[PDB]
Each structure stands twice: as C-alpha cells, then as structure tokens.
C-alpha cells in the first residue's frame, strides 16, 4: 500500500543515511557538470563524522532521557514493593537491607546534630554549675 | 496473558477501526491507548506476550501491528532484551513464510528484522543473520517492489554484520544484484522502482565497504550500475565512486575506469553520463598520490584522446564540449607534476606522435587539426607549468612544428587558433 512504499522508501533513506551520513534522504549540461562538480567540492567539504555526532547527540540524549524515565519509574515501582513487604512482614532476607542501610543513614544524619564525646564533659560540668 | 490479550484487541481495533466504520479521532484514541498500554508493561513480558499474539492474530494487519509494537519494542533499546529480541527474530524468521503471503506483511516483518540488525550490530550471533540473508535474497527473487528493497537492506545490514561470513554468499548474489540493476534499469514502472534501484545501488557501496578485495574485483561493474543509475542522485553516486576510490587501488581503478568509458561512457550521449565518466577521472587523478612510477601513460593518453573524439562526434553541445574538454585538460595536468623524466620522454614522444601522425588513434574520425590543436594547448599548458626540460621536448617537438610552420606558412592550416597557440 501507499503505507508500505513509504515505510520501503524511509528504509532506504535510513539506509542511504547509515552508509553516507550527511547526504539528504531521497523522496545546461555545463551548467549540470558544473553543478556535479560542485556537489563533490560540497560532498568534501561537509564532513561525515560531523553529522553523525550531530545525529548521535540528538539520539543518545533522548535514549538518555527515556532511559533515565524508565529507571526512576523501576526504583519507584521497587520502593513501593518493599514498602508493601514491610507492611505484610513477608520482606525477604536479600529484602530489607536496604530499610537497615537507610535507617543506619537516618540515624547517623540525627545522631550527628546532638554533641560530640568531648564537649559533653564541660557541657555537663557547666549545666551543673548552671543549675546548682 | 492478560496484557498480550488487550494488546491484541487494541490491535485489532486500531487495525480495523475504518473497516468497522465504513474516524480519526477514535484512531487518535486507539493510539494514546496503545501507547499507554506499551508504557505500562515491560519489553521483556511485552515481547513474551506478543510472540503467541502473532501466530493468534489471523489478520496480516494485526500482525503488522504487533511488529511495529515489537519495533517500538526495540527502539526503546533494551540491551538485556537483545536475546529475547534474537529469540522475537528467530520467531519472526519462522513466521516469515507465513509472512511471506502478504506483501505488506513481508515488507513490514523485512523492514522490522532489518531495523533489529542495525540496531543490534555485531553483538548477536551472525546465523540468523545468514538465514535473513538467504530470505532477502529469496525476496529478491519473488521482485516485489517493496519487498525487495526491504530484503536488499536487511541483506546490506547482514552483510555488515557478518563481514567475513557475509564473504562466503557474496560472489554468489553480486550477478543477482547486477541483474535486479539491468531489470531496473529496463523497467521504471514506479518510483519505488527507482527507490528499489537506489537501495540497489546502496547495497553495491556497503558490499565495496565491507570487502574491498570482492569489490577490486567487480569494481568495473559497480562503475557501469553507477553510471547507468541516472535516476540516483549524482552526489550520491560520486560519494561511492569516491569511496570505491580509497577500497580500489588508483591505478587499477584508472584502467577499469579507462575501459568502462570505452565501452560504454564514449558509446553514450548522455551529458549526464559523460559528466559523471568526468568527475569519476578527476577524482582518480585527485587521489593518485605517490606512485613516481605512473605504469600507465598510454592508457591515460588514449583516455583523452578518446575524450577529444568524443567531444568532436557528440551528439551534446560545442560549449559543453568545450567545458569536457578543459576538464580533460585539467585531468591531465599533475600528470606534468610527477616527473620521471625516464618516462616523461617516451610520454612526450607518444604524446607529439598522436598529435601529428595520429599514430594508434582511438578514433579515426578525429581531425588531424584539431588534434595538433589540443595537444598544442595541452603542451602550452605543461611548458607553463614545469618549464626547464620542456624546452628541451621543445627542441623535439620544434621539428614536427616546423613542419607546421611551413604548413601554416604555406596556409595549409587556416585554423586562427592553432596557429595563435604554436
């Protein structure tokens, strides 16, 4: 159908595009010599290495992109099947260290606001003298 | 199961929405919700859903969807699915004769298949890739339009993706390619056609890509399709004559190029034609480098000798002609540049016997005239360019000259213009 002969005719301009990138996809006699002529000067001066990082950049940003999508939906998806585990007490043993590492986390970033082992002696000799 | 079922329906309704109702909007909507559906479930349990859903799925328009899905499938580029994107393939390769009864559905599962290679490389095993080769070149031979572009870059991307492999089948599906060339050139009845030859020619530059010693070997016939194919497009054409140019020694090249222009390019009135013979000798020339040792001045001399008669016997114009032959001009120059002077003097032997005898003319209808006249030009244009041991050839060529002299003394030469260049 017309639907096929596009897809068949967009094969071959992404095939076209792989072997040569930087060449449009395909759809006097002096004067067209001179035109050949100056469509290789043009063919020279246009670089293949050019366009196809020009090409890559585009594509590894949005493959980087999806990629990146489908990573924060799976550490979602994870988050909310360990939450669900803790709520049935079925985590697993591999399970659940995770819930430890981020408690250990928590409880060093509270534990690191309260005082040090040093200063705890002169604040308990000062709050004596304070409140004697 | 459950997934692969609503897959299908969806499918299905998308795939028969206008048969149904015989618009847009619900197939907008069929679409937002196959998108959504394709979105919610991974690639891995899609792929397992949908490889019973296209043996279940009777209609070739359901299985067309469900191919563009698993194609949406891998261009997500899931890099642990690539195996169970090898087992889609061999389950797509083992439906391709079912596949194989719809022309749409063919073109749609080659195109798919193609798409995966391209998209896997060489990280895969190759077998399959041979298998998809043997079905391209059985679609070629089927000859459908569509279907044979299809298999002619899945049959390119295998045969980038095998190499060596791909080296065994070659020799044995280059004539087939050069016969699909002739066929297409023959018959021109759609512009797929001429998209199909294109492909054609597409596959003739990753196959010299892929093996320059195959491509050495059958380089005459690639320049013959190249310019044959005047419905390709001229930059894309010089661009694989350029790369054939580096895979292809320079000097092999020439002599190739020398006896396709004698066989073809001067029995050929195209402009287009000749233009192309043109820029594909400069850029020979552009790209002989080194080699102090030319090892072929009379071929390049025939070369232009030929190019002068053809000029004079065109059926194209007198300023085109003209502009050819600066062109030729311009080719034979840097041949001045590499001096042998060992070898140069025999070349300038040669050269002054063609311009005054004619000794060994490719073409006997020349003007012995007009042939002094453009060898006068050619050796002005040399003595401007080296001097030094010219003048020496000079003193060589004075003799023949005053003959001439005496000739153009006695008005046996009227041409103004020769005689304005001795």
């Known amino acids: 159908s017309q639907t096929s002969k596009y897809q068949a005719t967009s094969v071959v301009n992404g095939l076209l595009s792989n072997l040569l990138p930087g060449v449009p996809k395909i759809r006097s006699k002096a004067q067209l010599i001179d035109r050949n002529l100056k469509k290789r000067v043009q063919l020279q001066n246009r670089d293949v290495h050019k366009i196809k990082k020009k090409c890559k950049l585009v594509k590894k940003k949005k493959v980087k992109k999806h990629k990146l999508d489908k990573e924060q939906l799976e550490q979602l998806a994870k988050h909310q099947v360990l939450k669900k585990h803790q709520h049935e007490g079925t985590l697993t043993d591999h399970e659940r260290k995770y819930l430890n590492k981020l408690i250990k986390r928590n409880s060093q970033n509270l534990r690191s606001w309260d005082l040090e082992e040093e200063v705890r002696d002169e604040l308990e000799d000062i709050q004596q003298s304070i409140l004697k | ?422």
Not at chain 2, 121 to 137: C, R
Not at chain 2, 229 to 242: A, P, T
Not at chain 2, 343 to 352: A, D, E, G, N
């Open chain 2, 1 to 422: 199961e459950e997934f692969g079922t609503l897959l299908e329906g969806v499918l299905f309704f998308i795939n028969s929405v206008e048969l149904t109702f015989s618009t847009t909007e619900i197939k907008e909507i069929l679409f937002k919700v196959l998108g959504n559906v394709l979105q919610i479930l991974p690639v891995d349990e899609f792929v397992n859903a949908v490889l019973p859903l296209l043996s279940t799925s009777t209609n070739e328009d359901i299985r067309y969807h469900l191919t563009l899905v698993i194609g949406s499938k891998f261009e997500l580029e899931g890099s642990e699915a690539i195996p169970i994107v090898n087992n889609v393939m061999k389950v797509l390769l083992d439906r391709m004769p079912l596949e194989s009864k719809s022309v749409v559905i063919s073109q749609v599962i080659l195109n798919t298949m193609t798409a995966l290679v391209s998209k896997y490389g060489k990280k895969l095993e190759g077998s399959i890739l041979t298998q998809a080769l043997t079905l391209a070149t059985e679609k070629v031979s089927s000859d459908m339009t569509e279907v044979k572009i299809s298999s002619l870059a899945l049959i390119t991307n295998c045969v980038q993706v095998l190499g060596v492999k791909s080296i065994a089948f070659y020799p044995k599906i280059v004539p087939p390619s050069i016969k699909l060339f002739d066929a297409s050139l023959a018959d021109s009845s759609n512009p797929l056609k001429e998209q199909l030859q294109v492909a054609i020619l597409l596959l003739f530059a990753g196959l010299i890509k892929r093996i320059p010693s195959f491509l050495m070997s059958n380089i005459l016939d690639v320049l013959h399709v190249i310019y044959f194919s005047r419905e390709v497009d001229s930059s894309i054409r010089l661009s694989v004559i350029s790369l054939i140019i580096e895979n292809i020694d320079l000097k092999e090249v020439l002599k190739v190029l020398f006896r396709i222009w004698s066989t073809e390019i001067a029995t050929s009135n195209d402009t287009v034609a000749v233009s192309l013979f043109l820029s594909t000798l400069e850029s020979t020339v552009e790209n002989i480098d080194k080699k102090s040792a030319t090892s072929q001045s009379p071929i390049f001399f025939k070369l232009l000798l030929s190019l002068f008669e053809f000029r004079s016997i065109s059926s194209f114009d007198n300023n085109t002609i003209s502009r050819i032959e600066a062109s030729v001009h311009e080719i034979s120059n840097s041949y001045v540049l590499k001096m042998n002077d060992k070898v140069f003097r025999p070349l300038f032997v040669i050269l002054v016997r063609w311009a005054f005898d004619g000794e060994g003319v490719t073409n006997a209808g020349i003007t012995e005239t007009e042939r002094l006249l453009a060898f006068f030009k050619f050796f002005n244009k040399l003595q401007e360019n080296l001097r030094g041991i010219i003048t020496s050839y000079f003193t060589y060529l004075l003799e023949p000259v005053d003959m001439l002299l005496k000739r153009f003394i006695s008005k046996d030469m009227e041409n103004v213009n020769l005689r304005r260049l001795v």
